[PDB]
Amino acid sequence: MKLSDLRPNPGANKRRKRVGRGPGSGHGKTATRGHKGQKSRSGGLKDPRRFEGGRSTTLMRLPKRGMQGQVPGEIKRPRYQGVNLKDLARFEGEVTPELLVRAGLLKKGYRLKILGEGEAKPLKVVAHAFSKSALEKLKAAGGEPVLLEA
Template structure:
């Protein structure tokens, strides 16, 4: 049964296509429920057959022509003008279509962003597959070694005055040690037989043999503590003067190094030795 607004639209389209055909009123397709109408249904031609006879061409061709020029077709549906933004995805993990992670984003598009260094797509990275070798102590200290034979050679050459205090700055200025001094200087006993006169030194560490050789000649060795900033102020005081800064105060040693040093380092670089005091008058205890 064809009725209502769809039927009117169909009739209007049909009339537009058949502009040359005579305009006739279409029959009423509302079926009657009377018995005479039912018997007449099988005897008289149907309304569609009458319409086909009046129009003079195939009904299938008419439907095909109407579908090609319909007002609304599914394959012509489009968004309103200006609607070009993609729908924002929510609840889809990191990024959610905003391009914050690497890989593929919404609808297969390549997302913007980078992966963190060492990421290999979720598998075990190579840095974890390779075995570890060795151990580096984060609390270890690195000292620049200097032997007594080198000091004796510089004294004989007149570059070091044996009557003055030999500090780490003196050793650096006379090229007894290198320029790369990390945590201080360590005195070793190589060439101890060349020390025939008393000398006084201030270093960070000293071996047992070197200390015994210096004390046997009438000299002394004091183990002093300097932190990183204090060591720079000792070796390069001109840097602070260039920057217009004052020299820092000497730092106290940490608890784990108190038993390994004799006193706190002095700033600026000292030129005279200080005598050793009894244990109860140790400078570390008094400061």
């Protein structure tokens, strides 16, 4: 191919933007802002995803999701990420953490809890926690140690 040969196929040459140019482009004079007042003016309106015109907004609902934390902030506790048997029905090695995340299922700072639905491959599954239900399902095919080391 040449350069006088290139070009983008349809929908991507949409590059055509809008306007406040002539009459019978539409979009002229009042520039699609209508005759109007506040919204037509330069600054625009208050944040319209939030402002309700002076009456109390829907900030009339209430905080229940209590304990928003106190000044020192978040407490560093452990956190466990779920995986499903189905997802780990992929490979057929010894299935461990680190090995799991190094594949796209965990996220670095999360302790491994296998669980959930799927068919239990006959395999050893090194895990930090198991669901009552997935512990049983896979106990009918393979081994499943629990963790905790320094």
